[PDB]
């Protein structure tokens, strides 16, 4: 019950085969010293704090408490409403909506920015052993269909 309308590194992390929170996607280092990565920190009756960021190859605040988010860097606001087992949510950046469907054995979601950004993340679990993942990235205006598929089996 936290997610940042997590389209980044959750549905574009599924388009390749690759190789107080402390969040880090630290790829690797050198034999001298390097990061290649991410570093995130944070900081009552409300849920608040203040974060940092450093990358290689950003300071803001927090306010959270249906749950509304908040972030003011050198700025993001988002919400997430509870509706039934089917969900919703809106966000803005200073502007897309969320379509979470956390219902069991068919947990999927999609989003749609007020632009040519349409990103659906279908995820079907049709058997208790196997799972299917359909990753739609249909950009109509920039004309790219960046779709991806998937499967995962085990007997």
């Amino acid at each position: 019950q936290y997610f940042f309308t997590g389209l980044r590194a959750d549905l574009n992390k599924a388009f390749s085969m690759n190789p107080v929170n402390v969040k880090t996607l630290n790829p690797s280092f050198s034999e001298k010293g390097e990061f290649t990565g991410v570093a995130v920190a944070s900081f009552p009756q409300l849920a608040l704090g203040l974060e940092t960021l450093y990358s290689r190859t950003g300071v803001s605040y927090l306010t959270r408490y249906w749950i509304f988010s908040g972030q003011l860097q050198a700025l993001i606001a988002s919400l997430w409403r509870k509706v039934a087992n089917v969900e919703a949510g809106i966000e803005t950046t200073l502007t897309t909506i969320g379509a979470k469907y956390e219902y069991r054995q068919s947990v999927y979601r999609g989003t749609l920015d007020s632009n040519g950004k349409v990103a659906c993340f279908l995820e079907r679990k049709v058997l208790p052993t196997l799972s299917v993942l359909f990753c739609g990235e249909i950009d109509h205006f920039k004309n790219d269909t960046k779709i991806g598929c998937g499967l995962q089996f085990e007997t």
């Binding site: 085969m17 034999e31 010293g33 779709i147 991806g148 598929c149 085990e154």
Partner: protein, 418 residues
């Protein structure tokens, strides 16, 4: 007083009798039987037959049968990408034996293609046939250093005696590898004299190569990654028939003198010898077959591929080498950080890497005892059972004038350090 099996349908009852009659039978009633169960307890988990290995029952649990991991990736730029892998345990019905086929495949259209295949057949309680058919691509010196690709097969055979004369792990391992290897220079002309000497332009191309192997390891250390006593000895041979002959020898000896292993003193010795059996020095040995020195997982306090003879700036290996190294570990005396795998580490490495002109073993040991490239430094280590973090601060005592010195901090990560 009796043994009972439970489950054990994922294999064959008669081939399990080979495992049971070896260690569990002919065991004097309580003489060796408590360890004789513990030998088979660790054997069937490494033969991939038991995922989770008076009366002595056999708690054997089958691993899997399929692990398929397929999936595609379009990008509409004709950037299609697909990948597939499955660790299929083929059923014991219709071959005879415990077999373990693997099929990693990765097709990318703007990346190179991978075809790892494996088939671990288990002949005896102490034998493993491993047939490995591959097609891979990796980068040799650096990302923009050299691009090596390897098509071909590799038959192999292990043998580890579970009963010895004298837990001293001992195994022999033979192999036989046919390989078509393409070497491509992927360094740009902007970084102009790097990988562009006369002997790196000449190594580029294709070659086909049959090789015959051997590897004898006698490990008496009480742990393979975080030891505190006992020695090691690993002896590797290779033979590409009519082309070359390669021999490595590697010793190790760990000893401690304090109560809870507070001072750990290690000592490693490596040495090698590569001969050219190829009809008056025609057919040169490939650059990926010669010995390279330097780096974090080697003589520390130099860069990787940082010692040896050079043509312009390219480390071109050597036909013979020696290396050594001491180490003291101290186990963090800050009054409670102790009992953890974090030691204060003082080392002293060194070695020499030489082309020996292929005449005798008399001049070659004359070349190896002359001008070594030593270093030293103090650092902090972490010794996980499956990893080894090392952050040293190194100083090169003596070196050559064209070594890649790297006299400062150094981060080391791997499994084998010398």
């Amino acid at each position: 007083a009796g043994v009972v099996t439970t489950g054990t349908d994922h294999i064959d009852p008669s081939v399990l009798q080979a495992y049971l009659d070896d260690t569990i039978m002919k065991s004097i009633t309580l003489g060796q039987l408590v360890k004789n169960a513990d030998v088979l307890n660790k054997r069937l988990c490494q033969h991939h037959i038991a995922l989770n290995a008076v009366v002595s029952q056999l708690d054997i649990l089958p691993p899997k049968t399929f692990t398929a991991k397929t999936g595609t990736n379009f990008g509409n730029d004709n950037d299609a990408e697909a990948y597939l892998q499955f660790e299929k345990l083929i059923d014991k019905k219709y071959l005879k034996l415990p077999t373990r086929v693997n099929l990693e495949i990765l097709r990318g259209t703007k990346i190179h293609s991978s075809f790892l295949f494996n088939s671990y057949s288990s002949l005896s309680p102490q034998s493993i046939l491993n047939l490995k058919v591959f097609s891979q691509f990796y980068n040799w010196n650096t990302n923009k250093g050299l691009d090596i690709g390897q098509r071909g097969a590799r038959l192999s055979l292990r043998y580890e005696p579970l009963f010895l004369h004298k837990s001293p792990t001992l195994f022999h391992e033979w192999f036989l590898e046919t390989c078509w290897r393409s070497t491509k220079i992927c360094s740009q002309g902007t970084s102009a004299p790097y990988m562009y000497s006369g002997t790196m332009l000449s190594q580029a191309g294709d070659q086909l190569r049959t090789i015959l192997g051997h590897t004898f390891v006698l490990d008496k250390r009480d742990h393979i990654m975080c030891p505190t006593k006992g020695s090691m000895l690993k002896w590797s041979n290779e033979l590409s028939p009519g082309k070359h002959l390669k021999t490595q020898l590697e010793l190790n000896s760990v000893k401690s003198w304090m109560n809870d292993d507070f001072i750990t003193f290690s000592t490693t010795i490596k040495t090698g010898y590569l001969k050219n059996l190829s009809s008056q020095q025609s057919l040169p040995v490939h650059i990926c077959d010669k010995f390279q020195s330097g780096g974090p997982s080697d003589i520390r306090g130099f860069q990787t591929f940082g010692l040896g003879p050079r043509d312009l700036y390219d480390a071109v290996g050597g036909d013979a080498f020696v290396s050594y190294g001491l180490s003291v570990f101290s186990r963090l005396p800050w009054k409670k950080v102790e009992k953890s795998n974090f030691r204060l580490h003082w080392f002293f490495n060194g070695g020499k890497l030489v082309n020996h002109d292929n005449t005798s073993l008399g001049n070659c040991i004359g070349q190896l005892s002359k001008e070594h490239s030593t270093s030293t430094g103090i650092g902090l280590v972490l010794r996980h059972p499956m990893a080894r973090f090392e952050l040293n601060f190194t100083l090169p005592i003596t070196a050559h004038e064209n070594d890649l010195i790297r006299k400062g901090f150094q981060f080391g990560l791997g499994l084998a350090f010398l």
